[PDB]
Symmetry: C5
Subunit: 118 residues, 5 copies
Amino acid sequence: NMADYNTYQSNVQINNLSYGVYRSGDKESQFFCVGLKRGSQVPNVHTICKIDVFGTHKQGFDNMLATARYYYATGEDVRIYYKENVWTDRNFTAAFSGNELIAITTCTSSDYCMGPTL
Amino acid sequence: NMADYNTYQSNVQINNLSYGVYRSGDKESQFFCVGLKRGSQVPNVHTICKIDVFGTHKQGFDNMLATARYYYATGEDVRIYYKENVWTDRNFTAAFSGNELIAITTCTSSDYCMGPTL
Amino acid sequence: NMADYNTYQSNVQINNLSYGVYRSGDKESQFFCVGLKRGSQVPNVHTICKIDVFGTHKQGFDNMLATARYYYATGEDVRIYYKENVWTDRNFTAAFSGNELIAITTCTSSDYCMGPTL
Amino acid sequence: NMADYNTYQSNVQINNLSYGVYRSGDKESQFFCVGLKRGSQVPNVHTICKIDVFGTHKQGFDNMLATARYYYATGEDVRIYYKENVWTDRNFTAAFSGNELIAITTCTSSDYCMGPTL
Amino acid sequence: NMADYNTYQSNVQINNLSYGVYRSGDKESQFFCVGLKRGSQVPNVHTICKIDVFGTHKQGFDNMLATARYYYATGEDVRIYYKENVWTDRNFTAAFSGNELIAITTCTSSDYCMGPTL
Ligand SMILES: [Ca+2]
Ligand SMILES: [Ca+2]
Ligand SMILES: [Ca+2]
Ligand SMILES: [Ca+2]
Ligand SMILES: [Cl-]
Ligand SMILES: [Cl-]
Ligand SMILES: [Cl-]
Ligand SMILES: [Cl-]
Ligand SMILES: [Cl-]
Ligand SMILES: [Cl-]
């Protein structure tokens, strides 16, 4: 299996977006977070973030932001891959979450979506 | 609390946009500013700016600009996080404001915008 | 003939998209994959990927991504040029494919897409 | 007042756009120009340009281009700040103009545009 | 006159787009090409290309691509400035053309496009 691709939520929509700049530790950072819904429900893990100078995978900040904003704009069904309990800044996690955004793929029906499944 | 996230206006719309180049002191800079409305109302702080080579957070000029431009285009409800009394160039503050743009988040209703609240 | 331009699918549509970050071997990478259809049909080779730090051609990651995203949005008829059996990470190829994305061109009719043909 | 912000036209529209590459003297450059209208009229100064490797302010080429292209698309009322008779290449000024683009801001009415005013 | 601005097609439409990666000599390159129509007719010169690491003007690849994609999206009347017989890769010219894209400008009517004329 593809490392860090075993945790995901399928057929969700990105219905909120946060983008901001923020100092954490000794690093000046950028971050964004997606807020998730699944139809009228709010999924268990519903806030996922990516930070430019922190994380399991620091590459792809701009591309991941553009991708998320695009799906925010369309409101289409997606699968979000993420990694839990990454962020150590307790102020950041309380306001948002500890989840790191790993990947986003598109969905054509219930439980297909592009990408690896368990 | 997340430092610099304690000051914000919720459920506003970005109804004006400025982008320009400008020399301040001896430094060549870029800046943009968002102008705010709240329905027919004008919020306490209504002009917020970001500058590429100045400010409490220099990172993220391009992403913040594209993000602001997007919300200007849709005119949707957003929350604006900002920092007061930042800019020391009195020519700039008189023309725009002393406010530095920190973050922009989306709103799902008149009771929910993404991000930390007081 | 143009090297790497001898394998392609004409008049297909991009109907799915994946973007992600991933450690492959000893490298931190970004990737995306397009999923292809031909009307209601799914061609035998239907998944094509590009990776920023791996492949026969590492250049053009951002531009190819933006290009792929535009055509996903319009859903218009395109020709996809690709190279088979490139990726050696069996975790990746099993979840996605071994195909490398080389070029995308638009189509004017059922008989004509821009670019070189066999 | 903000240096280089004393010359502008309020409530004009960008109704034409030029982007190109060009060798000027011994330098390889990019440039773009906006062409202006004011309703059904053409203002006295109606062509304003920005060049990547020349000018009073070389910074912000890509951001200014994107900014201008957006207003070209919306055709909305803007205020254009510019500096006259900057470019010295007479082939260029004859084809386009000698004006350097400094800033673009939006207008809510014929009595309000964002930015410093006289 | 502006060197390399003496050859152009006025009031054409970009009706096709090619983007790709390709090795030429010892250079890994990106290229794109626009395909041109003039209403229902196909103009004498109908394929014009720009290559990131080759040409009379290597600068402005991303910006020229963005510009071309924009006019492809709108299908609007443009003027294309180009240079003939530039590419020496005969496999490339056979697939596309020997034409280098120099500039693209907009047209407000059937007798006016922005930029210098003969
Ligand atoms: Ca909303
Ligand atoms: Ca087509
Ligand atoms: Ca409009
Ligand atoms: Ca307006
Ligand atoms: Cl959560
Ligand atoms: Cl204010
Ligand atoms: Cl496949
Ligand atoms: Cl002023
Ligand atoms: Cl003029
Ligand atoms: Cl041709």
